[PDB]
Each structure stands twice: as C-alpha cells, then as structure tokens.
Subunit: 289 residues, 2 copies
C-alpha cells in the first residue's frame, strides 16, 4: 500500500505488469483500449480506470506498455498538462531514436519520464529470470525503486540518463534471442528427419548454449582491441563447416536458407582478408551498413 | 599408458586431441601431411610417424581428424588390409551422409569404425566443458571408452549404431553456435555505436543466453506436438520487434541483413496463418526446402 501505480496498456506484458504490482500490495489501476482485457485483473482486486485520464489521475506512477511508440504518443499527447508531478515509465518496445524523442516531448511538458525495457517473456516477470533496464533521471528511478523492484528485484538495473539506452539494449539482446531460437529450430528441423524429438535435442542444445557463453566472453575483448586471433578455429574452418551444414540441410530436405546466410557472411569475412582470423573478425561484417 | 593411440591430422583440433592423449599418459603417435605442425607435440613426448602406415601400425586405436571426409578417403582407402585388429575413430566434420558412406566402406574392409563429433573449440578438450559424441558399434565404444575419456569424461557420449547420427547432431549444434555468436556480434555492433565496449555487454548477453534456454525448453514439446500456443508472445509481437531491430540497425548505420532476414522468416510464418501462434511455429519455416 501507500504506493499506487497505474498500468496503461493491458496486453500480455501489460497484464503481467499489473499482476506483479497487485500481488506486491500496490493499489493498481489498469486501463486498456478493449475494456474486456482488464476484467481478470479487476476481479482480482485491480481498479479499472474508465479512461486514460482516470488511470493517469489514480497514481503518481504511470506505467506504459503498448504495441508501438506511435500508440505511446497518441495516449500521452492529449494529457501533456495532466502529467505534473508524476513519473512515466514506458516499457513499450521501440528504437533508441523513438525513446529519445518521447523524452524530448516529456522534457517539454515538464514531466519525469523513464524508458524501460523488459527482456524476456511475461512469465519471467516477478521471478528470478526477470530483467528490466531503465534509462533517464536517476533520481526518479530511486524514488520508485521499491515499487519498480516488485517486477523483479535482482533483475532491475538502472542504465543511465540517455533515454535511448534502454531501447538500444533491448534491441541488442533481442538479436541474441532470435539467433538462439532460430539456431535451435534449424537444429531441431534436422534431427527430426531422423525421427529425433525436439525434446530429446533440447537438453543437448541447452548444454551447448550455456557453454558458448565462454566463447562469447572470449571474443568480446577481441572485438574491442580489433585483433582477431584464431585460437579456436580460423574463418576458413567456420566457412567449411557452414558449407557442410548448408549441404546437410538441402540433402535432408529442410530449409538451408539460414546456413546459406551464415556462409555468405563468412564469405565476406574471408573476402576482407580474414580467412585465418577467429570468428571475432565477423564484427566487421555486422558493422557494414 | 598401456593404451597406445594414433592421431592422424594435426591441425588445431587434431593437435588438441593428441595433446589430451599425451597428457593422460597415452603413448601417442602423431602424423600430419605437413611435418612441422607436429614438432611442438614431439618435444612434449609424442612420437612422430613418418607415414600414415607407421601411424596405423603404431597403435590399435587410430583417431582421425582431417580437413574433410575427402581426405579421410584419401588416407584410409589405401589401408584396407592394414586395418585389421584396429579401431578407427573419425572426428572429422561432415554430413550425416558422408559419415555413413565412410561407415559402410569400413564394414567392407572389416574394420571397426566410430564416427565422432567434437562440439566446441579445441581448448575445451580434456576439461569439464568438452562435448564428444560417438556413433557406431557400442562394443567398440565401450572397449575404448577410458582412452576416449582423456578428451573429456563428462562429454564422452555414445549416440547409437547409426554412424551419421554424430554428424547430424554435430550439424544441428553448429547452427546454434553461429546463431548465438552472430546475435552477439549484431548486438555488439549496435551497442558499439553508443560507445558500449563489447566486454561490458558480454556478461549481460551471457545472462540472456542462459535465460533463453528456458524458452528453448518450453518450445521443445510444442515442436513435437505440432501445436504452437502463444502464451508468451504471438508471431505478431515477434514480427513487430524484428522490424524495430531492423529499423534500429539501419538508423545506426550498421547491418540490417540479419534482422531483415529474421523478419522474412517471421513474415513467412504469418503468411502461413501463424500470426497468433508462438515462436515454436517457425519450425515449419525451417522444414521448407
């Protein structure tokens, strides 16, 4: 109690946010375009705001989670005068550029605005797996740190004052997640041709995912120094193995699109004269517009 | 000791394999097309064979690890009669088909053949992080399991009698490594634009890579069931986030090829009517030639 919060936007991630605040004993007011998306929470103790104004007026902490920043502007523009003395935390997925622009607007209507990024599925909220990054005024963050930590004590992390940093980190970590899921999906498509079940491949795949973190830590400084030694394998070795994965995919009858794509990037790596460097030299390829 | 082993092919992974046998006290004989690449091993207590013939005779367990299955045929075929009373272990990277064609050739010459797959960089061998998959006659694996353990006791696994299973599992795991690494490189390029040094982003990435295994575990049964519910995020939400990552990359002057490629697969999913399914539905896109 004594710390009301309003969640504007009741999607899957929004609902999880309102639930976390409710369970944590915070007076939680919710609002969503489709009112039906707020019934469960209201029946569980949440206060249903009839309008965006009702939600904004219910608490000093206003949490935003909608589809796009376009929906963010549409909801925040008509109340630029109603945000006096409040703090706005926006968990909506967007680009760093969109984050800074909404900050500019916020800075103009004299209101505290925090840009937040939720890293992972809604089920991770209010669990040990929850990771939430914040960017903006460090003061406002600390004012509500107790309230914010209801969504994940250990995972809460204040980034800095640059409002776009949260979105940037959000985008960078998302590429990692899709890279893992797609890699796993490509591997599961293969072993399925041998009547191997995805569940059977899941533990082995996860063992390898966890271990590769070691290589991740190894290539990190090489990306910083600009020197890419080939202590584990040369780009040519990678290129060859990528060709085997491509060829194996076409043979077994599954998509070889991703293998071809990976081998294409290795082509340019060796094309740039990095055939005898470690995979870290791939950073140059990803820096090319 | 008491278990002499021969290692044919002394590149990076062959040198590490031999170095493990030597470190475990095995009388280790090495051979490489280029002799100089074995001088380091001889000064450390390894015996250099002048020819493949000497190496084959030197030990009852012959471990191969060369540039490709093309060289395995080049070196094995001339020794069809000299392979009696011996066990050949081929750690070369190749397709499931190649591992079978090689496995069938061995049956003709009445030699014991085990198709081995080494998961991870060379330096993981002889540590708790080494993953080594074996395919073939169980009796052969059981009879030389102690010798093979020198490269990794916790990773030494027997897959079954299908010799290509190793190459398959190998191939499947290769995709996961490039996905994680490429995803990490993509994010490193993004955060690099904001002067975020890679070693500062590595630990965070490693936290997500570790976490995402939970999502891998969740999708595994949906893949085997053919039902892809959207409890975390629908294909639509995945789609919108990929576009943002794509716009973000282009805005920051880096490569949007991987993001735009990730979105293409997602669009194909929505094109097949999976806009309301979870990401496990993309398995159908990887099953498409």
């Amino acid at each position: 109690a004594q710390a009301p919060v309003s969640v504007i936007g009741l999607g899957l991630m929004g609902q999880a946010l309102a639930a976390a605040f409710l369970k944590a004993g915070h007076p939680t007011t919710v609002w969503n375009r489709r009112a039906a998306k707020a019934d469960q929470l209201v029946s569980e103790g949440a206060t249903r705001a009839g309008s965006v104004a009702d939600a904004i007026a219910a608490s000093p902490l206003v949490v935003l989670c909608v589809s796009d920043y376009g929906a963010v502007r549409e909801l925040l523009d008509p109340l630029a005068g109603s945000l006096k003395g409040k703090v706005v935390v926006n968990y909506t997925t967007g680009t760093s550029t969109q984050a800074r622009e909404t900050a500019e607007w916020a800075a103009g209507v004299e209101t505290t605005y925090l840009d937040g990024a939720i890293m992972g599925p809604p089920p991770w909220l209010a669990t040990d797996r929850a990771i939430l990054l914040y960017s903006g005024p460090k003061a406002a963050f600390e004012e509500h740190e107790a309230t914010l930590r209801a969504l994940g004590a250990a995972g809460t992390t204040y980034l800095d004052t640059d409002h776009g940093l949260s979105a940037l980190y959000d985008m960078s970590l998302l590429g990692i997640m899709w890279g893992v899921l797609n890699g796993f999906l490509q591997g599961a498509a293969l072993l399925g041709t041998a009547k191997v079940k995805a569940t059977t491949f899941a533990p082995l795949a996860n063992t390898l995912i966890n271990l590769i973190t070691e290589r991740v830590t190894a290539y990190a400084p090489q990306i910083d120094e600009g020197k890419y030694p080939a202590g584990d394998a040369t780009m040519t070795v990678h290129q060859d193995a990528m060709e085997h994965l491509a060829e194996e995919s076409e043979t077994l009858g599954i998509s070889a699109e991703m293998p071809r794509f990976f081998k294409a990037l290795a082509d340019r790596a060796v094309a740039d004269g990095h055939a005898d460097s470690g995979y870290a030299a791939m950073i140059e390829q990803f820096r090319k517009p």
